[PDB]
RNA sequence: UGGAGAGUUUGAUCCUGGCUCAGGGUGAACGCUGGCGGCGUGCCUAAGACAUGCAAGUCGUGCGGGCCGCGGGGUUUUACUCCGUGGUCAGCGGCGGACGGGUGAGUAACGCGUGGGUGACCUACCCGGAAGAGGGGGACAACCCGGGGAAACUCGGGCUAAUCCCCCAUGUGGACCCGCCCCUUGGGGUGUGUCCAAAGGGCUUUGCCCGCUUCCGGAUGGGCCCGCGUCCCAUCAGCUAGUUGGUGGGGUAAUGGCCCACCAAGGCGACGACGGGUAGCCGGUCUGAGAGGAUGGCCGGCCACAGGGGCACUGAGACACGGGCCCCACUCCUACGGGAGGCAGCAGUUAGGAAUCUUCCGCAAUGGGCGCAAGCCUGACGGAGCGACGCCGCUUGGAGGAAGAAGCCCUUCGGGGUGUAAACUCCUGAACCCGGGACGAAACCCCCGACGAGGGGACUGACGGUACCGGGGUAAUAGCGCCGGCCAACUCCGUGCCAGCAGCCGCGGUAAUACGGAGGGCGCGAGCGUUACCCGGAUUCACUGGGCGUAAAGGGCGUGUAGGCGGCCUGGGGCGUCCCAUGUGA
């Protein structure tokens, strides 16, 4: 399965959750992981597409 | 109303009972072609009279026996062992399908 | 018994039965041999009440038999007004 | 809720003044007089040919973003005119104007659909003697739209309500300036506005 | 713990043996109408016939027997006692037969 | 009254052809975010395993007793019966427990769907029609009695009433054999012979009411049978001993090889038997121009199952979820002296899973069971609760407001943008506070009239002080996706085949509208995206509606079986086909 965005925190055994979508680049690859799901975290001081990416809405303010 | 068919008699080799052979013509659900069908039936001969080409009517009726819930109604033309063949090769040609 | 009897239709808080024939051990909204007009007891409408009167006595006749608030609204009805 | 904040951004970025604010909108300066080009950094840029969805997309929202809904209530309202009779399309703009908020915008008892809206929501008008506080009502003939009692004053109403008279209310319409009410009279004809949008493109977008 | 109509099977319990008892009763009973049929001694035979026939009727009443089953039985029997006697026999009486 | 396409094979073209997007849908789940209300909807996986409560009871107008009462029968020293009187615990008997509720495992079959059949059949309670309730005997609980058991209780011993049980009798009337009669597959009529009926309880008691037994009807609900329709693999081509028919029996409400004997050797299959795989079927549902394709979840109809299996009893009715016996698996209790349980009922727990809720309220209403009726039971149902899971409705404001501040972005340093946006000024006013306050409820019952027709009179609202009504009254959450082409939305910076994006075509190699952030823009909005799946686009299984010289596709060539197709004329038949009428199509 594809780890997607700007790393990550997955050691070795650490559970994870499947998506669905090929790579194409990566042949044998037809699953993403979802992000902050589980073991598998979000993309740190990511402030796009946080959608995907499990990332959460960051405060802008104060 | 009791159903009313019309077939011909392809086996009297049961004792008072008899094989009776039924065509339908109607088209085709999807392709509208007129096709045919056929049904056998095992029809009451508490007398046996009927035979071997006998193109006869039959009618439902209260189960005689399992399989055998059709009495025959009248002879209507007698002697037809010519559609009687057709059933016959049909069933003969069965023996050139065996997987072998 | 056969019997006459109120189903209930319409929505939640918004009752709108259908008076009906059925066997007693049908469901109280189960299938029905024939209805016989409605009933909105919130008096929403004119038409908060209807029956064949005819047919309503037939079934009566035969030996159907409607529910303790069910001949009040036949009674409601005259179904039971036998004149003289 | 509703689309809220940047208005007269839309006077332009259609391209086309649209009368959304009060007086503003009307009057020498309504997003567009000053800048009658699009919005943001690439305003005063050339622009490249559009495309035919490009065309037919601007045309829709132009149509909903006039009367101010959500796409959810706008389209529904599209089916219904698409299923409908005969010309099942440009009966639309009917169904379109017998929303309550809508009428009382014709009706001149306010001057922004968007002020329309906050009276009919808190209330302040009234059908057939009814406290009716819903913008999406699909008024119909011979209805009456009147100001509540408890409001019937209010500085608000009076200047809105006065200067009314001046023009001839539309033709499906009808007003006692004095007895503060209107009538819902026709359904207006595809004739009775010739809106600045070209409804038939609509359709066609619709029919992705 | 549970409900005390389990009755309704301890009720059924004596339906059971009492319907079963004269359920026994009939057949041994009739029993010895056919054998009798069978031996020429048409005279005894009838007087079981007629008791077998009291038999039945007298249950068909209840919950034990019912419906043609009476009728199945009562045809069958005198469709076939009868159809003993025809080896002589002589029909010693009508006393069960509408002969 | 209904049909659109685009991207990608080449340096370019036309064609074939596949991959891909734009549309709509979901019992959904997941990410970011999350204000209100309404109406819906919620174990799709383990038909895996379940703690606890609850889901079926009722009548003292069947009967006998317990105790409490109840007053007071009445007393050779705490009562005493005497009913009635209540109510009472059970036992006796009676009705329902076979409906309602859950589940989809199994089932490719008359299970379903549709149209028919039964001269081959049952149908309790309800209604109508005809006649009777004449009398005679007895058992088991209860109570008592001892024994045994830890209990579960259990055996044994002894009395007793009825609507319990038995018998005699009556016979309108019914059943059975043989006859003739008509009719016709065991329908109807009758002749003789022989068999069959029972029940009492309550009184506005001397009259009625609630029940009893036979028969024929009616109506409702069914059982069985039949025609046609109903998935994938022929890389499953042969199948069959109750197998097929007969005769006679057994059995059932009744047909039948349903079972059993005996006799015959038949029965089935390229029109796809037999075997295998998947599946509960339909009304519907989704999509589609349509024809189709897809699907069966909530609701409704039917079938099937009630831990896995088997079996029968009672009964009008079942082979019975919350009845019974047995076997197995599993779990629990116990002085272990041995016994107990069946959530696919309502909630709830666990386990599995990406994932699916309250161990709530009330019988007020509807419906169902019992009863003369009050009244009783009802996790059916009526409501409430939890979840943006869906649909819908509504809010986070409105008018004003600059040649248009600050900050932040670009900048050819002239300026442009965010932007009427804010501020700011007026106005209203979601929420919240006060008051009032439902509909949903009219009958059962009660009065007069005959408790009938009738008027009339009376009790009861779980939801709930809820919605809604009045007044007062506060400017009060916004997020998510995208902005290379398809496809709507462009610019600085960073990065430098790295970190990374991607639905396809492809972007990244120090000037990237394709990565990352920023400004700005497009698009929806309490929602926005994603993933998975169904239909569309796909005329890409093409019936409507396609092809086979070189693009994938003519069998190497004959002969021929079944099959498909068939020239010119006139008749009869009217099978197909066509019309009308009618029923059915819930
Ligand atoms: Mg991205
Ligand atoms: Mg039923
Ligand atoms: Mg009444
Ligand atoms: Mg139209
Ligand atoms: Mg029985
Ligand atoms: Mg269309
Ligand atoms: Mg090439
Ligand atoms: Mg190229
Ligand atoms: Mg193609
Ligand atoms: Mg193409
Ligand atoms: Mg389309
Ligand atoms: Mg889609
Ligand atoms: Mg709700
Ligand atoms: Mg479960
Ligand atoms: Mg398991
Ligand atoms: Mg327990
Ligand atoms: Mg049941
Ligand atoms: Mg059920
Ligand atoms: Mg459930
Ligand atoms: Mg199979
Ligand atoms: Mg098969
Ligand atoms: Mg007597
Ligand atoms: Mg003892
Ligand atoms: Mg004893
Ligand atoms: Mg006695
Ligand atoms: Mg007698
Ligand atoms: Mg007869
Ligand atoms: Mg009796
Ligand atoms: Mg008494
Ligand atoms: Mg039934
Ligand atoms: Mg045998
Ligand atoms: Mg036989
Ligand atoms: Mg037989
Ligand atoms: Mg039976
Ligand atoms: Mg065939
Ligand atoms: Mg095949
Ligand atoms: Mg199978
Ligand atoms: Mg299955
Ligand atoms: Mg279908
Ligand atoms: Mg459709
Ligand atoms: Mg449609
Ligand atoms: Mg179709
Ligand atoms: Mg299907
Ligand atoms: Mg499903
Ligand atoms: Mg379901
Ligand atoms: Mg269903
Ligand atoms: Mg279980
Ligand atoms: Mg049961
Ligand atoms: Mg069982
Ligand atoms: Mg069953
Ligand atoms: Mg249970
Ligand atoms: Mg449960
Ligand atoms: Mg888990
Ligand atoms: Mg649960
Ligand atoms: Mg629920
Ligand atoms: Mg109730
Ligand atoms: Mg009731
Ligand atoms: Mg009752
Ligand atoms: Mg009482
Ligand atoms: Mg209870
Ligand atoms: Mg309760
Ligand atoms: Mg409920
Ligand atoms: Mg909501
Ligand atoms: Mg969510
Ligand atoms: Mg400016
Ligand atoms: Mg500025
Ligand atoms: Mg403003
Ligand atoms: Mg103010
Ligand atoms: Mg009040
Ligand atoms: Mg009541
Ligand atoms: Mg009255
Ligand atoms: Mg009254
Ligand atoms: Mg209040
Ligand atoms: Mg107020
Ligand atoms: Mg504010
Ligand atoms: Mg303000
Ligand atoms: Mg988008
Ligand atoms: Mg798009
Ligand atoms: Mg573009
Ligand atoms: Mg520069
Ligand atoms: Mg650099
Ligand atoms: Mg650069
Ligand atoms: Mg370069
Ligand atoms: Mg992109
Ligand atoms: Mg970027
Ligand atoms: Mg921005
Ligand atoms: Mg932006
Ligand atoms: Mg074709
Ligand atoms: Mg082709
Ligand atoms: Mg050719
Ligand atoms: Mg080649
Ligand atoms: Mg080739
Ligand atoms: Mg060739
Ligand atoms: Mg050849
Ligand atoms: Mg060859
Ligand atoms: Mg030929
Ligand atoms: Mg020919
Ligand atoms: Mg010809
Ligand atoms: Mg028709
Ligand atoms: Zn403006």
């Known amino acids: 399965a594809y780890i997607p965005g700007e790393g990550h925190n997955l050691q070795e055994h650490s559970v994870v959750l499947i998506r669905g979508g090929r790579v194409k680049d990566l042949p044998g690859v037809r699953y993403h992981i979802v992000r902050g799901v589980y073991d598998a975290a979000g993309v740190k001081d990511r402030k796009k597409s946080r959608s995907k990416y499990g990332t959460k809405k960051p405060k802008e303010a104060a | 109303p009791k159903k009313v068919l019309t077939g011909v008699v392809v086996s009297?080799?049961?004792?008072?009972?008899?094989?009776?052979?039924?065509?339908?013509?109607?088209?085709?659900?999807?392709?509208?072609?007129?096709?045919?069908?056929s049904k056998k039936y095992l029809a009451h001969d508490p007398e046996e009279k009927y035979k071997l080409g006998d193109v006869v009517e039959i009618i439902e009726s209260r189960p005689i026996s399992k399989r055998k819930r059709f009495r025959?109604?009248?002879?209507?033309?007698?002697?037809?062992?010519?559609?009687?063949?057709?059933?016959?090769?049909?069933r003969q040609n069965y023996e050139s399908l065996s997987k072998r | 018994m056969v019997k006459i009897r109120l189903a209930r239709f319409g929505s939640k808080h918004n009752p709108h039965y259908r008076i009906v024939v059925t066997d007693a051990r049908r469901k109280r909204d189960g299938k029905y041999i024939e209805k016989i007009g409605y009933y909105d007891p919130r008096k929403?409408?004119?038409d908060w009440l209807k029956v064949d009167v005819e047919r309503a006595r037939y079934w009566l006749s035969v030996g159907a038999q409607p529910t303790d608030t069910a001949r009040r609204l036949l009674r409601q009805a005259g179904v039971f007004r036998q004149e003289a | 809720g509703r689309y809220i904040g940047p208005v007269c951004r839309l006077?332009?970025?259609?391209?086309?003044?649209?009368?959304?604010?009060?007086?503003?909108?009307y009057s020498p300066k309504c997003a567009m007089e000053r800048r009658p080009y699009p919005p943001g950094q690439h305003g005063q840029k050339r622009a490249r040919r559009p495309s035919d969805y490009a065309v037919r997309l601007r045309e829709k929202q132009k149509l909903r973003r006039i009367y101010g809904i959500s796409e959810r209530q706008f389209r529904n309202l599209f089916e219904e005119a698409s299923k409908k009779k005969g010309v099942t399309g440009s009966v639309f703009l009917g169904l379109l104007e017998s929303r309550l908020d809508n009428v009382v915008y014709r009706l001149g008892f306010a001057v922004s659909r968007r002020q329309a809206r906050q009276l009919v929501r808190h209330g302040h008008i009234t059908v057939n003697g009814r406290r009716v506080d819903?913008?999406?009502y699909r008024v119909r003939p011979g209805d009456e739209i009147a100001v509540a009692e408890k409001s019937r004053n209010l500085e608000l109403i009076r200047q809105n309500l006065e200067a009314m008279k001046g023009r001839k209310v539309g033709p499906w319409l009808s007003?006692?300036?004095?007895?503060?009410?209107?009538?819902?009279?026709?359904?207006?004809?595809?004739?009775?506005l010739a809106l600045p949008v070209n409804e038939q493109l609509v359709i066609e977008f619709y029919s992705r | 713990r549970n409900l005390s109509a389990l009755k309704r099977h301890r009720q059924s319990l004596k339906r059971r043996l009492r319907n079963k008892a004269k359920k026994s009763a009939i057949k041994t009973l009739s029993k010895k109408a056919i054998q009798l049929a069978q031996e020429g001694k048409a005279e005894e035979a009838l007087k079981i016939m007629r008791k077998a026939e009291s038999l039945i009727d007298?249950?068909?009443?209840?919950?034990?027997?019912?419906?043609?089953?009476?009728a199945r039985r009562k045809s069958?029997?005198?469709?076939?006692?009868?159809?003993?006697?025809?080896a002589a026999g002589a029909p010693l009486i009508g006393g069960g037969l509408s002969a």
Not at chain 2, 15 to 34: A, C, I, N, S
Not at chain 4, 182 to 187: A, D, I, T
């Open chain 5, 76 to 86: 069958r029997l005198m469709r076939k006692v009868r159809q003993l006697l025809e």
């Open chain 3, 44 to 46: 929403t409408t004119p």
């Open chain 4, 134 to 136: 819903l913008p999406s």
């Open chain 2, 72 to 90: 025959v109604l009248r002879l209507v033309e007698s002697g037809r062992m010519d559609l009687v063949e057709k059933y016959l090769i049909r």
């Open chain 2, 12 to 37: 009297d080799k049961m004792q008072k009972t008899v094989t009776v052979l039924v065509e339908r013509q109607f088209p085709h659900p999807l392709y509208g072609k007129v096709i045919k069908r």
């Open chain 5, 58 to 70: 007298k249950a068909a009443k209840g919950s034990t027997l019912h419906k043609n089953a009476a």
């Open chain 4, 175 to 192: 007003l006692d300036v004095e007895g503060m009410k209107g009538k819902f009279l026709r359904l207006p004809d595809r004739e009775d």
């Open chain 4, 11 to 25: 006077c332009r970025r259609e391209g086309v003044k649209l009368y959304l604010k009060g007086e503003r909108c």
